[PDB]
Amino acid sequence: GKCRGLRTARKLRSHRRDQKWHDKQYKKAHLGTALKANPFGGASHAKGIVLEKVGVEAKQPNSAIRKCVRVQLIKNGKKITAFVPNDGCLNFIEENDEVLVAGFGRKGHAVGDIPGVRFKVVKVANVSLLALYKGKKERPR
Amino acid sequence: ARGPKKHLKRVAAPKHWMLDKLTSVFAPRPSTGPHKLRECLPLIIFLRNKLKYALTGDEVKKICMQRFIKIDGKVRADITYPAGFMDVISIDKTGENFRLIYDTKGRFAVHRITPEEAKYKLCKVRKIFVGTKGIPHLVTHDARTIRYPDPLIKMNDTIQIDLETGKITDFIKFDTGNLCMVTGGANLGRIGVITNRERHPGSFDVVHVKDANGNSFATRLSNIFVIGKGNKPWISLPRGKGIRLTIAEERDKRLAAKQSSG
Amino acid sequence: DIQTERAYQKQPTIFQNKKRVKLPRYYKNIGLGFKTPKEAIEGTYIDKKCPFTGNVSIRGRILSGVVTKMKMQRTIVIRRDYLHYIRKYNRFEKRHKNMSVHLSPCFRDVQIGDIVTVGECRPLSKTVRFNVLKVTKAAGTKK
Amino acid sequence: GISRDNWHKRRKTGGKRKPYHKKRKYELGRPAANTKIGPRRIHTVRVRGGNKKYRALRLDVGNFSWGSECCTRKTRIIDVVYNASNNELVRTKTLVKNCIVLIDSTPYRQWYESHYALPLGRKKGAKLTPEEEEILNKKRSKKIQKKYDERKKNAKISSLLEEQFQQGKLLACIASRPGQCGRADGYVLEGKELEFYLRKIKARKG
Amino acid sequence: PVARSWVCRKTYVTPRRPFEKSRLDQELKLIGEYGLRNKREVWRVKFTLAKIRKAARELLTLDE
RNA sequence: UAAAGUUGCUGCAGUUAAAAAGCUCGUAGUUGGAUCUUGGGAGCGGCCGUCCCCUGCUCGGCGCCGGCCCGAAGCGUUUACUUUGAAAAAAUUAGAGUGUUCAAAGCAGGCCGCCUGGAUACCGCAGCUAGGAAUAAUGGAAUAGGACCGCGGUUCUAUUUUGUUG
RNA sequence: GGCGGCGACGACCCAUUCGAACGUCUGCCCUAUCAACUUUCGAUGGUAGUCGCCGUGCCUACCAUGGUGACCACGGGUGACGGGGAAUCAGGGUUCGAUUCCGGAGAGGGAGCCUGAGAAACGGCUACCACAUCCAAGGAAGGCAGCAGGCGCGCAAAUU
RNA sequence: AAACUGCGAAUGGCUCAUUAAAUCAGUUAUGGUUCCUUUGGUCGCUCGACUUGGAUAACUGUGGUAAUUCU
């Protein structure tokens, strides 16, 4: 600290209180802007309906076409590019199918190659995309 | 709540009942009566937890409705009747008589008294009142409105009533050097001679009490009861004698008694 | 001099219309070793909310403060300064609670800055719960 | 209904309160009695604790006290003259505590004329024609006429009451709450009180 | 408002660094030597010691 | 949540990495120089260490020929600070005891009817209480309406007192 | 014919118990892109009433011009019921506490009242607003934020 | 059995919408109040019929409405 007075408790406290809004992590989690703006509306997961399948160009140096899905959510109706994770799993997704979407890892931030893609696809039509990939469950048809 | 509460939660029950955690959601809520909710011990808890004559609270209903239990000279048939300090429980068909005296810990203990001792009990007075035609009135710690008492009896004196008639026989006056059972706070169950009164206009008067091993301690005058003139008590005392051996000395005596016995 | 209200002002206890051939004044000791002043006994004022010559009993808390305003009639605003301990920043902060307190007109000579003792009682008004018991005059101010 | 609540209204600071609970029962107002002068109509009201409370709505008599020589009698209330609280509770003749009412004098005049045996009121010139209290002024024994004489020595009444007893109507101060207890009891104004309230009735008059 | 306990504690603590070669060495030594079945079994004996040890150090701050 | 001494009271930074107002004044806020009790009397242990002491004015008991020695209630700067005491629901946490077969738990149990347990600690601040008086605030007597002295007077007044009744 | 034991029930009032209510001191998160607010539809006082179980601008009438504020009033926000507590934690702290104990509040939204010691009760009543059920079309009945259970909502939660 | 009378139905349970000196916590007060119940008092304290009055419910019996814990 800088004021070491014995009666400086409101100066020391009110200063910290004021300067704590220059912390980015705090301001995010203590304003209503980051939460009202969040597509998931402050949830871990969210279900939405697949409307088209998109091929996103990898940022650069590594140049592949990442098979994401444009998803309209149920709760808000907001539109989301959600990455289909594992190898050749865009075959398991058709149009107008409910997908459970999760975050990618970096808490509302683009992860590696994929630009402007913050989310991944977990389940397709109440069947886990791992079980489809491994072939432990088959798609309900 | 928008009226009086009729249940007591097992957890919210006072600690000095020593009710377990796991048997029931509810504790026996003491019926209204002479003693306070958190200063009494219901008949049910005396009859099935302390003495274990019952197993359940339906057994205690069967015991008490045979009219075999007689608290301070009159038969009650309420399982949640508040039996409190200095009360005499006479279980007559067993031929037994119990006084509710505080052990060295804050609980009431199983203190067996002789049928002669069980005929009188000692009562701290709460206030002196002058009734509707110059009639002097006492009010004891167990709500006995005793009218035409001895004029020397003042508040914080104790009076020896005979159960059968409900009339005063003797009385200890609140003076220094008199024995004192502490009936409230951290010192609940201590016995010692009153060595000092410390007056506080408005606030609560505190009373220093020397013990039978020179262990002097203070107490709020509200939480004090005189049990004999000088050094001789007017009741029989439980083992420990309200002297309060420390936890180091308790460990020593418990360990000495276990190892020596076998 | 007095009795400027539409109703008649008098002490309720003392009776002043006994047949003849100076009115007697009710007072009391307040308790807690606080001396009833001379101006309460010898004076001619009439205040139902005086703790010496009124229908109010001092019980519970005795506090003090510094008289800061005297613009309300028969009542004053005192100011209680204290130090609240924030334990994070192992320090105090200066904090104050100003309370409206009734000022008995037996205390004729009271100036702002005088350290007044006050006694808890029944609520006299919406915001008043305290009567003045004694006034100790400010540091110096003998003139 | 009409509430007696401390929460509906601003703080010291002038900050409005948000109410946290709806109107409780015990936070109760009942409409004002506004009791009048007429044939005795008192309505019992149940209050908190199953206790009773008597709303007088009309009330024409009261147990008033003449405190000088400590006598009190049931006397007819005839007119409300002055109310210190509201000036418009005189026109609408509403009995409340600390009202200034005219009452009958004849119970006190009867007591005085029977206890002191001296003609009080009674405008000078006239006589008593029934000859009842004319005989109650005279015809005593030896030692009891001496008792009335020893009493008569210090039997002076004030010229203010002498005037009011002459008109047949005393000024009384209501001490009971007729809204609450259902009674219109009080005391008779004397000395500084009477001089004060006669000055206030005179100032209101013009 | 049920008449149950809910009171329960963990008996182990997972270590901060999950892949310390020297820790994996010494704990598998303890398991093989005293014939245990998992690392939780060493971690709980370590936690019983740390409780005893924490209690003992708390007493050493107090005067004789 | 820790890691984050990357919100910094402990405890961070601000020449050049992000950062000292263009400069000065200034009211709250915050922080404020030094200075006002010290040397001893007495004893124990082997010159040193712990211990006892540096205010007065109704009723009593170690008593003595109205006083002295002693105790009790009261009066005796204000706090802050510290130390003690009173008081503060349980459950939770710490923790005592106790082989639920171990353990988490539980509050039980243990002896060839009896013997026991159901402890104890902690419970920030604020309020109550009694030591201490360094440290920090604060007070006085400076046109002397200053003390402590005994005196001269005045006004109101418990009533102890004139065999009882003015 | 007179006189009597042991109870049950009821009862004015007092005390006691169970409380409840209104007050005392102290303590709460973010916000100044909220700095002045409160006040003749009470704001702070005084006097006298009304009402109330009582104390009090609680409410009248009449006076007074007060009351609160950079020591952060007033206004706004809260994914705010509060506390005991919980998670992490060397020492400090940070975060959480809808949740079994205590206290508070509400029964779809406001409002009003009956009875009673205790209610502004909703497994009481009366309206209005909202939604909705039987109907022979005249009417009648409703309140699962009780236990199950259904729909909806959802990432998210069990047996009519 | 039913019905009248008395008592209970104001506790318990559920939820967290409201609520930021409010609620709540420690702390006091009630000498400023109310209190069924319980406990103990009081219950020939007043100076003036060896048991009174007539309703109503269950019951019995006629019914009405599509319908109600309607009457």
Curated annotation (Swiss-Prot), chain A:
Subcellular location: Cytoplasm, Cytosol; Cytoplasm; Rough endoplasmic reticulum; Nucleus, Nucleolus
Top-level taxonomic group: Eukaryota
Post-translational note: Hydroxylation at Pro-61 affects translation termination efficiency.
Keywords: Acetylation, Cytoplasm, Endoplasmic reticulum, Hydroxylation, Isopeptide bond, Nucleus, Ribonucleoprotein, Ribosomal protein, Ubl conjugation
Compositional bias per record (Basic residues), positions renumbered to this chain: 1-19
Entry-annotated residues carrying N6-succinyllysine: K53
A Pfam family it matches: Ribosom_S12_S23
UniProt-listed CDD domains: Ribosomal_S23 (cd03367)
Keyword Aminoacyl-tRNA synthetase: no
Gene Ontology terms: cellular component: cytosolic ribosome; nucleolus; rough endoplasmic reticulum; small ribosomal subunit
Record-listed N6-acetyllysine modification sites: K134
Region (Disordered): 1-25
Cross-link Glycyl lysine isopeptide (Lys-Gly) (interchain with G-Cter in SUMO2) placement: K36
Family annotation (InterPro entries): NA-bd_OB-fold (IPR012340), Ribosomal_uS12 (IPR006032), Ribosomal_uS12_euk/arc (IPR005680)
Cytoplasm found in the keyword field: yes
Subunit description: Component of the 40S small ribosomal subunit. Part of the small subunit (SSU) processome, composed of more than 70 proteins and the RNA chaperone small nucleolar RNA (snoRNA) U3.
Record-linked NCBIfam families: PRK04211.1, uS12_E_A
UniProt record similarity statement: Belongs to the universal ribosomal protein uS12 family.
PANTHER family recorded: 30S RIBOSOMAL PROTEIN S12 FAMILY MEMBER
Protein name: Small ribosomal subunit protein uS12
Curated annotation (Swiss-Prot), chain B:
GO molecular function, one term: rRNA binding
Primary site of residence: cytoplasm
Name used for this protein in its record: Small ribosomal subunit protein eS4
Subunit structure: Component of the small ribosomal subunit. Part of the small subunit (SSU) processome, composed of more than 70 proteins and the RNA chaperone small nucleolar RNA (snoRNA) U3. Identified in a IGF2BP1-dependent mRNP granule complex containing untranslated mRNAs.
Cross-link (Glycyl lysine isopeptide (Lys-Gly) (interchain with G-Cter in SUMO2)): K229
GO CC annotation, single: cytosolic small ribosomal subunit
Record's signal peptide: none
Domain named S4 RNA-binding: residues: 41-103
Record carries keyword Phosphoprotein: no
Source species: Oryctolagus cuniculus
Protein purpose: Component of the small ribosomal subunit. The ribosome is a large ribonucleoprotein complex responsible for the synthesis of proteins in the cell. Part of the small subunit (SSU) processome, first precursor of the small eukaryotic ribosomal subunit. During the assembly of the SSU processome in the nucleolus, many ribosome biogenesis factors, an RNA chaperone and ribosomal proteins associate with the nascent pre-rRNA and work in concert to generate RNA folding, modifications, rearrangements and cleavage as well as targeted degradation of pre-ribosomal RNA by the RNA exosome.
Family assignment from sequence similarity: Belongs to the eukaryotic ribosomal protein eS4 family.
Curated annotation (Swiss-Prot), chain D:
Lipid-attached positions, N-myristoyl glycine: G1
Residue positions, PTM N6-acetyllysine: K36, K127
Residue numbers of Phosphothreonine PTMs: T129
Pfam families: Ribosomal_S8e (PF01201)
Lipid bilayer topology: Lipid-anchor
Top-level taxon in the UniProt lineage: Eukaryota
Glycyl lysine isopeptide (Lys-Gly) (interchain with G-Cter in SUMO2), cross-linked positions: K169, K192
Positions of post-translational Phosphoserine modification: S159
Principal location listed in the UniProt entry: cytoplasm
Intracellular or extracellular location(s): Cytoplasm; Membrane; Nucleus, Nucleolus
One GO CC term on file: cytosolic ribosome
Gene3D superfamilies: 3.10.290.70, Ribosomal protein S8e, subdomain (1.10.168.20)
UniProt-listed GO biological process terms: translation
UniProt-recorded Gene Ontology molecular function terms: structural constituent of ribosome
Swiss-Prot/TrEMBL keywords: Acetylation, Cytoplasm, Isopeptide bond, Lipoprotein, Membrane, Myristate, Nucleus, Phosphoprotein, Ribonucleoprotein, Ribosomal protein, Ubl conjugation
Record field: compositional bias (Basic residues): 7-25
Chain positions covered by the region annotation Disordered: 1-26
Quaternary assembly: Component of the small ribosomal subunit. Identified in a IGF2BP1-dependent mRNP granule complex containing untranslated mRNAs. Part of the small subunit (SSU) processome, composed of more than 70 proteins and the RNA chaperone small nucleolar RNA (snoRNA) U3.
Function description: Component of the small ribosomal subunit. The ribosome is a large ribonucleoprotein complex responsible for the synthesis of proteins in the cell. Part of the small subunit (SSU) processome, first precursor of the small eukaryotic ribosomal subunit. During the assembly of the SSU processome in the nucleolus, many ribosome biogenesis factors, an RNA chaperone and ribosomal proteins associate with the nascent pre-rRNA and work in concert to generate RNA folding, modifications, rearrangements and cleavage as well as targeted degradation of pre-ribosomal RNA by the RNA exosome.
Gene: RPS8
UniProtKB/Swiss-Prot annotation, chain E:
SS bonds (residue pairs): none
Localization, UniProt: Cytoplasm; Nucleus, Nucleolus
Family, as annotated: Belongs to the universal ribosomal protein uS4 family.
Self-association state and partner proteins as the record states: Component of the small ribosomal subunit. Identified in a IGF2BP1-dependent mRNP granule complex containing untranslated mRNAs. Part of the small subunit (SSU) processome, composed of more than 70 proteins and the RNA chaperone small nucleolar RNA (snoRNA) U3.
Function: Component of the small ribosomal subunit. The ribosome is a large ribonucleoprotein complex responsible for the synthesis of proteins in the cell. Part of the small subunit (SSU) processome, first precursor of the small eukaryotic ribosomal subunit. During the assembly of the SSU processome in the nucleolus, many ribosome biogenesis factors, an RNA chaperone and ribosomal proteins associate with the nascent pre-rRNA and work in concert to generate RNA folding, modifications, rearrangements and cleavage as well as targeted degradation of pre-ribosomal RNA by the RNA exosome.
Protein name, entry field: Small ribosomal subunit protein uS4
Originating gene: RPS9
Residues of the whole record sequence present: 2 to 65 of 194
